[PDB]
Design a protein that fits this description.
With about 280 residues, the chain is mainly beta. It folds into 4 domains: about 70 residues, OB fold (Dihydrolipoamide Acetyltransferase, E2P) (Beta Barrel); about 80 residues, OB fold (Dihydrolipoamide Acetyltransferase, E2P); about 70 residues, Nucleic acid-binding proteins (OB fold (Dihydrolipoamide Acetyltransferase, E2P)), CATH 2.40.50.140; about 60 residues, Winged helix-like DNA-binding domain superfamily/Winged helix DNA-binding domain (Arc Repressor Mutant, subunit A, Orthogonal Bundle). Helices cover about 15% and strands about 40% of the residues. The longest helix is centred in the C-terminal third of the chain and has 13 residues. It is elongated. The structure holds chloride ion (CL). It is classed as gene regulation. Keywords: S1 rna-binding domain, structural genomics, Joint Center for Structural Genomics. The assembly is monomeric. The entry is titled "Crystal structure of a multidomain protein with nucleic acid binding domains (sp_0946) from streptococcus pneumoniae tigr4 at 1.40 A resolution".
Length: about 280
């Protein structure tokens, strides 16, 4: 029947080698381990992950393995075949994993495309074929940690993992956080696995997730003095001690302009939604 060692970690005995491979025996079958992965000696045991390659050969790898039967791993979509599903590269040598069309959206416009990213685990069927199973919301919730509430107006990459009529669920891989994009904050329907450049536009307290947009920042024309102050804030950590109550001397020493000119410039930045002020100074927002 089926080879229950496929897509699993095994300890096998190295029984032979050639210039390219160690040949590893386990339960009457021989698995080929690429020599370039590391040195071994014939007659010793070796631990690795057993699978089959695209040439139908039994393989073992000692490299780090991400997607297994028990653990999810990221894969890059390498090929779309409409009558089959999508192929994804999770880093198994000489093996890409098929995610079946039966677990992809019905609508082809929502399928992953080449270059998209999917978070999958492995399954072996009764014919010893490996397939990829998509993570669902609960898996992303287990992976991620609660978002922080100090990220407004930052941009981050965001990977689509779940599609709904109400909006798009995304994972932020640089941050290990979850977010959401309402339809009004994007253009075309995102596809499954699409990698987006998302801007933080709010914080959702109930589940500590980020509200995100794909829309451009508001166009806001700034006069020269306001632009000078904005560039200064961007270069000085988003903060300065100066505000509309500062002394003429301190304003002149830093910016070379009158207090009236400075107040007009801060007013322009306020109206443009770029700053806020309090007793401690002016903050970029
Ligand atoms: Cl809330």
């Amino acid at each position: 029947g089926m080879n229950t060692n496929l897509a699993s970690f095994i300890v096998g005995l190295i029984i032979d080698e050639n210039d390219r491979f160690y040949f590893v025996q386990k339960d009457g079958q021989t698995y080929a381990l690429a020599k370039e992965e590391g040195q071994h000696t014939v007659g010793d045991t070796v631990k690795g992950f057993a699978y089959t390659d695209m040439k139908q050969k039994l393989r073992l790898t000692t490299l780090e393995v991400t997607a297994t039967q028990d653990q999810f791993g990221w894969g890059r979509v390498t090929e779309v075949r409409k009558d089959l599903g999508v192929f994804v590269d999770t880093g198994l040598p000489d093996k890409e994993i098929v995610v079946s069309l039966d677990i992809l959206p019905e609508l082809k416009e929502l399928w992953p495309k080449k270059g998209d990213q999917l978070y999958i685990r492995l399954e072996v069927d009764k014919k010893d074929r490996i397939w990829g199973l998509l993570a669902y919301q609960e898996d992303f919730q287990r992976l991620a940690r609660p978002a922080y509430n100090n990220m407004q107006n930052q941009n981050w990459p965001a990977i689509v993992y779940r599609l709904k009529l109400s909006g798009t669920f995304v994972y932020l891989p640089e941050n290990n956080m979850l977010g959401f994009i309402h339809p009004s904050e994007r253009y075309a329907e995102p596809r499954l696995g699409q990698v987006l450049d998302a801007r933080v536009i709010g914080f959702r307290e109930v589940d500590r997730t980020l509200n995100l947009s794909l829309k451009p920042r508001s166009f806001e024309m700034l006069e020269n003095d306001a632009q000078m102050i904005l560039t200064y804030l961007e270069s000085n950590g988003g903060f300065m001690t100066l505000n509309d109550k500062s002394s003429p001397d301190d304003i002149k020493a830093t910016f070379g302009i009158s207090k009236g000119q400075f107040k007009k410039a801060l007013g322009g930045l306020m109206k443009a939604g770029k700053i806020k002020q309090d007793q401690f100074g002016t903050e970029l927002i």
